[PDB]
Amino acid sequence: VREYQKKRRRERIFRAAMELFRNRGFQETTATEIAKAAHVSRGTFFNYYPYKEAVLLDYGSQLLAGLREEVRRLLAQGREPVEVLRHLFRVLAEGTAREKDLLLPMFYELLNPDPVRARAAFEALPLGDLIAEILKPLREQGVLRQDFSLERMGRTLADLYFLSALRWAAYTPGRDLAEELEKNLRLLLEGMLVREAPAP
Amino acid sequence: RRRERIFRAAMELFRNRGFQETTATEIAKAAHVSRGTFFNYYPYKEAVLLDYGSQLLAGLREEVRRLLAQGREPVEVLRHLFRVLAEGTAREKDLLLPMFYELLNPDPVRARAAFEALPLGDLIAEILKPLREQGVLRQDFSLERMGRTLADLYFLSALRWAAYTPGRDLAEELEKNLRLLLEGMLVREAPAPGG
Ligand SMILES: CCCCCCCCCCCC(=O)SCCNC(=O)CCNC(=O)[C@H](O)C(C)(C)COP(=O)(O)OP(=O)(O)OC[C@H]1O[C@@H](n2cnc3c(N)ncnc32)[C@H](O)[C@@H]1OP(=O)(O)O
Ligand SMILES: CCCCCCCCCCCC(=O)O
């Protein structure tokens, strides 16, 4: 019973924090307000979430898990891997824009000077590995290079998504993020060098 | 000579005591100027790093334009540029890290100033020009845009390397960025390629 009670307590604290972050802002909301809203002590809030960003990482992990189900579902349905890739970035751009105010402070956590926290953020948001799953079928199809691992190429594309999304959210939210992510995808997938146009 | 005296004094304190630990007050004293005078030249400490970075880039720019002039192949010049960047980043990691972080300073005004002081993307675009003229680069993206994307990959790689994982071979990491962005992840196995 204690296990269930702890999971329930963590979820209530999580819900309480997300609502406050949404309604009043992430930076403006304190651990004491979250604790009060979830009916726990300030000390208990920290036992579950050592720092406020850990709450956002939990949300990000949830978002990524949904994207993982979606990607696996599409591949299983027989969608072309490249189209699944384009779709993923399209939805990533759309979702990032919808949740901009919550995701921005989350993105900075991946740049935390403290390496333990940067690593924690990285492990909670493994987009690189999800991309690698889409590249896999391409490698088996013989159209993907094999001098670099799937994980390394996936990591690279995810790193680009990260920098584009962060700069978009922090400095140029008026620009078209979907267009920017499509640019990253095309450039890394096809390269800057021209390719063969098939016969009509 | 005050701008140069301040820069020199600041770099020496950073060298001997550390960038984070050094204060404007100490730099001013070491350069024999008031704190007020120091700020006219450098509004904030990281601006000294931008000046340093801008100078390193100017050096690379000379070397690059020079090699192209003497007929070196564009791709080879690009390969050279990144070998140089990897080596330099490794040698000056402690001072370059806070500079890299200033590039993502939440304050848009500061982020912009940093970007404009360190235009690596524009230099890469200069190197791509001969390739554009040969007609072998896609035209749905400008040279500046593609060059800036390759510079972004250098930034991401260098920041990770310097802040979290210096055990990686940074030179190979940058060659990987170059290979992937130039050639793409998709194979190039046309039995009859162009050229
Ligand atoms: C909806 C919102 C979405 C939101 C989606 C958000 C996406 C964000 C994406 C990331 C954005 C950024 O990180 S921006 C960059 C700045 N931030 C960061 O880097 C985050 C913090 N970074 C780190 O903690 C580190 O750099 C890591 C964890 C990323 C990687 O470090 P690491 O694993 O020690 O080192 P790495 O170079 O990866 O691996 C070294 C060798 O170990 C090998 N190796 C592989 N597996 C293992 C293993 N099980 N056990 C031992 N070794 C292994 C690797 O193949 C490699 O071999 P070999 O081939 O080398 O010989
Ligand atoms: C020898 C070290 C030279 C360091 C040059 C740093 C250039 C950083 C460019 C960052 C571009 C960007 O992604 O905004």
UniProtKB/TrEMBL annotation, chain A:
PROSITE patterns from the UniProt entry: HTH_TETR_2 (PS50977)
Keyword Transcription included in the entry's annotation: yes
One Pfam family named in its UniProt record: TetR_C_44
Keywords: DNA-binding, Transcription, Transcription regulation
InterPro entries: Homeodomain-like_sf, HTH-type_TetR-like_transc_reg, HTH_TetR, Tet_transcr_reg_TetR-rel_C_sf, TetR_C_44
SUPFAM superfamilies, sorted: Homeodomain-like, Tetracyclin repressor-like, C-terminal domain
Residue ranges of domain HTH tetR-type in the record: 7-67
UniProt-recorded Gene Ontology molecular function terms: DNA-binding transcription factor activity; transcription cis-regulatory region binding
Secretion signal, residue range per the UniProt entry: none
DNA-binding region: 30-49
Transcription regulation in keyword set: yes
The name this protein goes by in its record: Transcriptional repressor, TetR family
UniProtKB/TrEMBL annotation, chain B:
Record key words, sorted: DNA-binding, Transcription, Transcription regulation
HTH tetR-type domain segment(s): 1-60
PROSITE patterns in the cross-refs: HTH_TETR_2 (PS50977)
DNA-binding annotation, residue ranges on this chain: 23-42
GO molecular function, one term: transcription cis-regulatory region binding
InterPro entries in UniProt: Homeodomain-like_sf, HTH-type_TetR-like_transc_reg, HTH_TetR, Tet_transcr_reg_TetR-rel_C_sf, TetR_C_44
The name this protein goes by in its record: Transcriptional repressor, TetR family
